[PDB]
Structure of focal adhesion kinase 1:
Amino acid sequence: ERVLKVFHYFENSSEPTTWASIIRHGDATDVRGIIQKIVDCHKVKNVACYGLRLSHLQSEEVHWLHLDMGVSNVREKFELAHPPEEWKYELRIRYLPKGFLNQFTEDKPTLNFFYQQVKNDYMLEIADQVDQEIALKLGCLEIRRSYKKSNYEVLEKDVGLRRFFPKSLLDSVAAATLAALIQQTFRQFANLNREESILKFFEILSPVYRFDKECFKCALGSSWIISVELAIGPEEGISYLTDKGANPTHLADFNQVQTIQYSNSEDKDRKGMLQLKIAGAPEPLTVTAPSLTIAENMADLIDGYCRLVNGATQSFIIRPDYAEII
């Protein structure tokens, strides 16, 4: 047999970075299998929001693995390129329900998985470059949820304030001001249960960090190709941004998607074509991605919402078994 290490975001009260699961598969087991086996352990309801992303520790390229793919195969293919240690597999939420948050409230593990997941990308992307008042509050919402000076001393010596706050904040604020700041911030969130916390966490982040969509610089049209930035998400579905400051312009709700079809661009250039039949409209929507990988990642993303919006486990892509947890 063969084994696979999968990182995820289910809180197992250890070090945040090292939450993973180790699961055995076979020549037959697919991606849908692996994912499910994991989400079942944690009694997840919103099963269809999870996807499996393969990131290369050495570079930026990410490959989102489609559900009906063989683990042995996909695993094999990428090992011809690079050795097993250089790759990393992570379970993530990628396909958000129309009213996701409100919906996650009824599925705790997924609420928390999403909380941990986002918070992580936050500490990794915008924490250091956003308003102090925003950093504070967020940081404090973690401590609050996760849990006099006789308590603050333990935070810096024994716990480490770096876990909750960006070092851009920590070196720009004196220790006493922060102790004072916390108490007063932590004050107004002082009667919010873990749930109201988490929500409040997002309430505060969303107007500054966009985590309810994914954007893709790519081009539209078939005969006259125009460069844009697609915006796939649950509110807008499929849209293009004029200014990042202006709201996205709509193109299609996922329920209109009839088929998703992808190839390379017919020439030496390895740009990626992605063509979608959309109900009611005559001419298909033709996306040209910088590369086939970027195309795969969009097709995946789009397909995911269709499987979600409609209740179907089967895929919209036109295309030319035992998992054990240990």
Q: What stands out?
A: DSSP finds ten helices and 14 strands in the chain. Residues 108-125 form the longest helix (18 residues).
